[model samples]
Target: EVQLVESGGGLVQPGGSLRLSCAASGFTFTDYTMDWVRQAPGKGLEWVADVNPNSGGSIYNQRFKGRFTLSVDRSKNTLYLQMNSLRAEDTAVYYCARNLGPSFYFDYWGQGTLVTVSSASTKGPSVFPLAPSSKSTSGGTAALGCLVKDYFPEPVTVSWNSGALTSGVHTFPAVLQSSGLYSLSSVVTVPSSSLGTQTYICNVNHKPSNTKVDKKVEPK
Candidate 1:
């Protein structure tokens, strides 16, 4: 059960500092090198840094050269990313991966943790519910879309009618907008017959501000 468990994600004020942790298990931590990577909301992946615990050496991206530090604790089998001088653009999901030396490929990666650098004006998400698309209705199913936008501190959850939905759901990652807010889109499909007779609710839960915003779609 070789695994890399990561934690320590949340909000950080601009110019503030934060540290993310990744704990390795069921493998030799020092035998393989580990790299730190990140992806901004709705953006491609970027390499942040890499560390060789065996030699206590590390390398960092030029953009983060002075502000990012990657280190490891052999006894705890843990890797840490210490970041400073955070900014709004620094908001992203950070991941740690075990690099396969000879091939230069990542063999194992930790579940990414999101770090949001926000200001004092933190706002909750605004949810918009859309009716089932005509294409899906004609195909015997109703595809409902939920657009959640203009939020801060990045961690939000969406639910359909206050319950867990395991099927026919597609949720896109939150995207950072130019207004310094985050936006996300989700689609849930259901039987076409249930469109008018039943009401589909999109519930958005923003944990940072303990806010709940919901939008309901119903036919007349």
Candidate 2:
């Protein structure tokens, strides 16, 4: 049995700082590596950084390069991450996991702790899609992604149109953008009957800014 617990309570506002801790149990402390991953509200997960307890070597995701600090204490069986210069975009959930070595993968993870940058600073989402092309579609199955990017104050809602597509939609969780915004893509599958038709749409509506950024596309 293995367990990973994340600590560092509540939310933090912009310019403020916080330290998150992950206490480990049921595993040999020095045998595996530990890493910190972050997920912005309404966004996909981002691998922030990792530390090796055995050799003390470490790596950080290019996006979090200067803002995140990773540390560990073997005696206490805990891993830590300290984030500074907090921005509105820095608001997110942080988790600690076991970096399963030989690759950038995590086998076990802790529950996340939420951090918010507050409503003082906010930005609306920018929405777009993959340029309409043959490579993005196939077998009457069109593969176009509605890109919802660059939003702040956390959380955004997305929706797709049914024209040139089946009724259902496939989407992944939004991920943190390097610029501190959030990004997400939605996939639409076209049925064989609608192959020759053109045009699709994606809607991004954010409440804080009361802004709606939507886009429609035609295949080329």
Candidate 3:
């Protein structure tokens, strides 16, 4: 039940400010430190800052030191990150990861929240089907993956389903592409014995178009 959830989505202009939140659950919030990480369009992960609610202390990445503020709400079991003086480069998917027992290594990660810089143009992602590779002799488990690309404007939510209830779904954070759009994927794993030759569906939802793209999937 351990989970880290990030929430923040919208547009901001250059020189503006924005706040992102990470709600921690299923664990004692005071026991671990939360680190805020960001990925710019087509770039790698960048450490933004870290905060421990127990002592109300924090560490900020030198590059983001003056531009980002990290805070925690002990009573709410939530961590907050505020970024100011936005620019096109500030547009990226931000995630909160849990530190491993007082260390800087992130053991658990949250799904990302995308923030967009107004002057930069945005686009929707193109959905594609992907084959899941979890098959092994030790276990009859297999998975299905949904791949999406060419998306923009900061955020998109990927989900899975079927004719009935869908569970065991894991969503990875959307990555920014060099082309200025975002790409994301999600997977669902189930026992091969229960595969049932079923047909699964993957859905991608983004802003403005609130409507989603649904793709039918077959177990490989």
Candidate 4:
């Protein structure tokens, strides 16, 4: 049995800091890699980076080059991430996840601790045949959304197919009660290249199996 438990909740004050723990119970920390992500109040998520505690090294999202840090302790079986220079826009839930070697997308994720800049918290996969399109235009943004059944606990992800969006984008900013099961949303954006005849797919990076719940789309 594999599990990832997170610690704490609520919003963090502006200019303040946040620290949460992701305890991987029944799982071997050294056997897997870890990662951190940010989810805005009602927007998408940005991948900060992943760390392999056993190696004491990390890899980060290129854009987040110098913004955040990820670390872990094998003895404690916990993962830690730190972000500075808090802005109201910097508010969101930060998650610690496991990087399954078999899957570039997360195979297991933390319960998700909300560390709002001053406020609150928030949201993957199955792939389906996209809307019929033999060819789509350029400058068009291809998008994918992941809807997790429960909003509490897990931050869903929208990954990708054929390596279009290498960050393997994902999101979780909305939660609604329609039939009583909360919904978590994840979205991946695919930007077209300067040429033509390109296909992009959006996939969800859900846990345990790391199955690809994807949507193949193109723009007008």
Q: Model 3: which residue pairs collide?
A: 123-152, 125-151
Off by over 4 Å in 3: 120-220
- Across 1-220, the per-residue lDDT of candidate 4 in tens digits comes to 7788876544456676656667887877798878887787688978778888788788888865666666787888887766655668776777777777746687677767766564333222234433322233243665443345543223345555645556645555646566333455545544432215755565555442234455655443
After superposition, the stretches of candidate 2 with alpha carbons farther than 4 Å from their true spots are 119-220
* Worst ten in a row by lDDT for model 2: 190-199
lDDT of 1 by residue, 1-220 (tens): 8899998888889999999999999998888998888999899999899999887698898999999998899999999999999999999999999886745578799999898887756688878876676474556666877899898877888877787564787888989888788999878887652575666777888876569987887542
Worst lDDT run of 10 residues, candidate 4, spans 119-128
Assess candidate 2 and give its TM-score to the true structure. 0.53
Candidate 1, residue 163: the lDDT equals 75
**TM-score of every candidate relative to the true structure:** 0.62, 0.53, 0.60, 0.50
Candidate 3 matches the true fold with a TM-score of: 0.60
Error of 3 at 25 (Å): 0.6
Each model's number of backbone clashes?
0, 3, 2, 7
lDDT of 3 by residue, 74-116 (tens): 9999999989898878888899999866557888899987787
Give the runs in model 4 whose Cα sits over 4 Å from its true position: 119-220
Best by TM-score: 1
In model 2, pairs of residues that clash are 43-174, 44-174, 44-175
